[PDB]
Design a protein around this nucleic acid. Sequence first.
RNA 1: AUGGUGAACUAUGCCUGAAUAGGGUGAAGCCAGAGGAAACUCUGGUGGAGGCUCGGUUCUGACGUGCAAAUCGAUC
Lengths: 37, 115, 51, 432
Amino acid sequence: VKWPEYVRVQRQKKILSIRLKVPPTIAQFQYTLDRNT
Amino acid sequence: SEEEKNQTKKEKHSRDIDIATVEAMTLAHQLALGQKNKHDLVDEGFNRYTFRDTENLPDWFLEDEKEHSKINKPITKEAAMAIKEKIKAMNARPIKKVAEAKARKRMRAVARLEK
Amino acid sequence: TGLLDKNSGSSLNLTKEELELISKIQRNEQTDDSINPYEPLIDWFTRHEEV
Amino acid sequence: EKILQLKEDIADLVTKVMENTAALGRLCKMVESKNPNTCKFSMLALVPVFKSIIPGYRIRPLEVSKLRNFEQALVYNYKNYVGRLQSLSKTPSNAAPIQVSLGILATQAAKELISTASHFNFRTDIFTLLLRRICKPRISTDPTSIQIIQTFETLLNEDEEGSISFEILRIFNKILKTRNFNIEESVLNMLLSLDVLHDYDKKKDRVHLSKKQRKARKEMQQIEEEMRNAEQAVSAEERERNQSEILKIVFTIYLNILKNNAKTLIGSVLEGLTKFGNMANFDLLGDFLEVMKELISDTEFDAEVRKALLCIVSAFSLISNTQYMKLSKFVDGLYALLPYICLDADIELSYRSLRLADPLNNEIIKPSVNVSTKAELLLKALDHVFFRSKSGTKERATAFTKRLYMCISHTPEKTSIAILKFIDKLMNRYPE
RNA sequence: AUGGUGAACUAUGCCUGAAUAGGGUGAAGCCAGAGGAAACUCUGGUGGAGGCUCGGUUCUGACGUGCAAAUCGAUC
């Protein structure tokens, strides 16, 4: 498959959001309030 | 046959150890002649680029970081000398290529009497 | 190292530790060990609530 | 007579594969353990199979015709094939005669493979399996050794670009660095065989093609033109890289032997340092000669007579080999040695001590530093003074004669004949 | 010196066209005949091929007391 430039960029940014070690003032987000609450 | 596999652990180590660049050569001089000791370089080691993971990350990202993660430290001519003396291999200047070099310059000295 | 030592006319070599330290500058690889790159954020200021 | 049935089963499997992927895997399932006849009758039968069926393009870099299951079949089975050969030839001298015979036939299978294989990336395993067999302090019970030396010699003769030779001598360097240079001199003769280093130089009958097929033919010819010129440039750079790193390997091998000072090896060391000299950095010529002067001066503090004769003959052969481009202590080396040469009883000795094979083309290849006994070393030193490497010196002509006549009193018969034949040539040169 | 205008002045081309003729000798091949046990050769033909033909640096040499009163050997 061949994707566009921006599609590849946001998919690359998605996997970059996971695979890097992140500072604890960030990732204090995504540890977020559950569905019921 | 254990040393046959244990010495190679040092032989491959001393390839990731040996100096290749002018930028690494200067810092090796700055150690060798007493300008900077271990303690001084450990200070300088904390860059704009420290505290970065490298093993978990995909290659298409690191191959764009490593190209652009080079701090332009000052060099010397003294270091460039030795790094040119380090890279020069055996067959770089044989008898053949010396005789051929004179065979070039004789042809040039002839071509300036052709006019 | 290509230069001549001051103590003796013999060629000035480098120790294994120094050569390791030069490489660890050039690939950035954490020079001062016995430290964590990823310390927990010890909230030295938010511990005490404001009145 | 279960052997006959097994012979015919394996024969049927051979006729299957030669003319199919499960059959080869089954043939590797044959050789595991405990059954020596299946471990030897099939292992030597798989050799012509691999000789016919190996594609030389470096297989394993990861439609109707699959060519992927077939190649995972060949490669995966070849791993356990050579891995089995590893377990076979690792057996020491204190083993069962069945296991030892399995080792001899395994190295026979491997040396047969190498002549056709060593193309694809499962070569280093076979190279270790033959060099570890050669590099042993005791060889008098292996008939394969002479032949394996011969195969390595041929390998370093056809190798033009230097990829094969570099991949051999890296492994060879590892073995010579673990064991403190206990080598058998024939292995330095296979070091001599390296041809990487030296230079020494219709209209009617046409099958009809379509317009699209002819245009495809033009394009394919242009691609192949690019492949010719690019591979010429690549191999011309590869030859330079391989010369540059092999000469580093070859010389450090040589000079570390010149640390240990084995009594037999020095002759073959200086075979190399004179052949594969003059292709070094040309700053090393003064350094090589100063090493030769050093190795003379070591003998001047007192076997060693052989060493000093070698230093003289080698130095003059070095400068006489400088074909492309445009000596006191060596002539004076002879002028000092001539008492010590004639005072020894070991002037005539055939010198076939630990060397097994006389390497390649000994009729054409003139071993210009270690030709024969020591009589031809005196002959070739004097020939390399008064006929090669000028040093005319009518004074030294009179001096060398007057020392030879105080050497006729201390000579065997053949040596004195040859010396007087050289004095005949000195009457030809210097009529005084 | 700064900025412009041009360029076969000379080497190597590439594409697409035009032109690459004629006179003489007579290559390979083939046919007929004669010597040759056999190879092969010769005599006579044919055949139409030939770059067929015609309109000065160096050896760090040999002799810096010569093979040389116009040098050898060779490289390119």
